[PDB]
Design a protein around this ligand. Sequence first.
Ligand code: RET
Ligand code: BR
Ligand code: BR
Ligand code: K
Length: 216
Amino acid sequence: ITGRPEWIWLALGTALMGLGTLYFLVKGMGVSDPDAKKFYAITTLVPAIAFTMYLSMLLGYIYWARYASWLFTTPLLLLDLALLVDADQGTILALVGADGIMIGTGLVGALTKVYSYRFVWWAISTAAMLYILYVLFFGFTSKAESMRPEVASTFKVLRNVTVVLWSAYPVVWLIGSEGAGIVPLNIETLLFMVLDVSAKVGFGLILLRSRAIFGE
Ligand SMILES: *C/C=C(C)/C=C/C=C(C)/C=C/C1=C(C)CCCC1(C)C
Ligand SMILES: [Br-]
Ligand SMILES: [Br-]
Ligand SMILES: [K+]
């Protein structure tokens, strides 16, 4: 069983999410700034949730826990960004709403019994994602630019990383088993794991290493 590629990617994901969680916990100890503490809580929770979900897929070894993890973590990552640019509550609610639709229709597309329809759900989900990225890239950038240089600079990096990583999910899904079935399952699992770790641990490393989280 341990020789199967599928199991290996799940095991590596579990290890990387767990290590990232522990490292963020270590980095956060000592920090007393009220503002920085909020970022540490959110950013530490994200890989912790993914670790539990990745561990679950290992114990179950199934990918239902995948969408469950995305359902919880994507809105948290959005909160992280919203907090950095001090976004309005109305805009935050719209983002979370679109995010729920994105993950939700994504699951419906994975569960659909008939072909052709797989892409209908993928299209609706991708539209939801495009709205989110449009808000992050054009909307949030304006607010960040009117903020402290450290904040404007860090937001732009996180934004660029988020846009690229999130955009890769619909591509992988389409070429994977839920879509056209071009790429084998083990490769698709590898791709999603790499994206998950990069979007959570990588994203968190960039954010938490920055002075932009402090109130100052
Ligand atoms: C930690 C995990 C993250 C940041 C996951 C992000 C996932 C997405 C942006 C997923 C998007 C999808 C679509 C746009 C359409 C097809 C189905 C999904 C759910 C794979
Ligand atoms: Br995840
Ligand atoms: Br806003
Ligand atoms: K401090």
